[PDB]
C-alpha cells in the first residue's frame, strides 16, 4: 500500500470515531438500494423490495456490522491486506461466486457514507486516503480468485 504516514493517521483518527453499527448497516443497505443488482447475493436476507425495507432489515444491519469489522482488521494490518483477506477472498470466490467488480461498488458507497456522517471533517485529503484504502481492500479481496 502506497500510504503516507500522514495518511495512515488521517485514516486511523477518523476511524476511531466511527459508529460501527450505524455505518455498517448504512453502507450495506445503500449498496443494495443504489445498486439493486447486488441483491442477487442476499435473497436469503428476506424483504429487500424498497429502501425502507432494506434499511430496516435486521440481517442487513447485522451483516453490515460484520463487514465493517473485517474492514477494521484491514486498517490495523495495512501493510499486509493480501494476507489479512486471503480466507475471505477464497470465500467470496469459491462459495459465494461474487464478481470482484462489486467490491469497488461497496468501497465507494462506504466512502459516501463516511462523508454523510462526518461532513466538514471528511476533507478532500482525508477522502483521498480512504480511497487508497478501499482500493487496497478491493484488490486484496480479489487476489485469490482462480
Amino acid at each position: 500500500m502506497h500510504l503516507t504516514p500522514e495518511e495512515k493517521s488521517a485514516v486511523t483518527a477518523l476511524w476511531g470515531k466511527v459508529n460501527v453499527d450505524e455505518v455498517g448497516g448504512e453502507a450495506l443497505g445503500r449498496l443494495l438500494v443504489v445498486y439493486p443488482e447486488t441483491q442477487r447475493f442476499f435473497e436469503s436476507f428476506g424483504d429487500l423490495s424498497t429502501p425502507d425495507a432494506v434499511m430496516g432489515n435486521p440481517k442487513v444491519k447485522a451483516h453490515g456490522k460484520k463487514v465493517l469489522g473485517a474492514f477494521s482488521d484491514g486498517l490495523a494490518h495495512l501493510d499486509n491486506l493480501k494476507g489479512t483477506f486471503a480466507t475471505l477472498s477464497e470465500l467470496h470466490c469459491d462459495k459465494l461466486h461474487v464478481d470482484p467488480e462489486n467490491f469497488r461498488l461497496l468501497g465507494n458507497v462506504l466512502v459516501c457514507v463516511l462523508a454523510h456522517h462526518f461532513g466538514k471533517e471528511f476533507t478532500p485529503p482525508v477522502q483521498a486516503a480512504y480511497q487508497k484504502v478501499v482500493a487496497g481492500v478491493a484488490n486484496a479481496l480479489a487476489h485469490k480468485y482462480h
Binding site: 438500494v33 443504489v34 429502501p51 462526518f118 461532513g119 471528511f122 478532500p124 477522502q127 483521498a128
Partner: protein, 141 residues
Amino acid sequence: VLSPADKTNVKAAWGKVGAHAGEYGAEALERMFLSFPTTKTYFPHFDLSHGSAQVKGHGKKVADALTNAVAHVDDMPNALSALSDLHAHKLRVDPVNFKLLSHCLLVTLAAHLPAEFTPAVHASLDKFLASVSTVLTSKYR
C-alpha cells in the same frame, strides 16, 4: 433509465443545492484531482493547487451544466449537444473518468446536504450522473 420518481428526487436535491452548486462543483473537482491523480492528465494547462482560481471557475462551469441538465432532464442529449461534442470528440476523455467525477460529486453532496442524501435520493442522483456521463461520452466513435 431515469424514472419520473428519479426525476423528482433529482429536482428536489438539486433545488436544495440552489446557489451553492458552484461551490460544490469546485469541491468535487478538487476531490477528484486528489483522490484520482490520473484525471489530472486532462488538465495540464491548469494550475491545480489547492484553492486554485482556475479550478474554482471551472467548478462553476460544471455545476451550471448540471443545472442545465436537470432543467432539461427529459431532453438531455439535445441540451448537452455542445458538451458532448467537446468531451467525446475534442478532449476525448476516457469514459472511466466520468465514473470518478460522479462519485466525487456524490461525496460532496453527501458531505454538505446530510438531511437530503437519503438512500432513495442517492440512488436517483447516481442514475442521473450516469445518464449525463453516457450522453457526454456517446458520439466517440
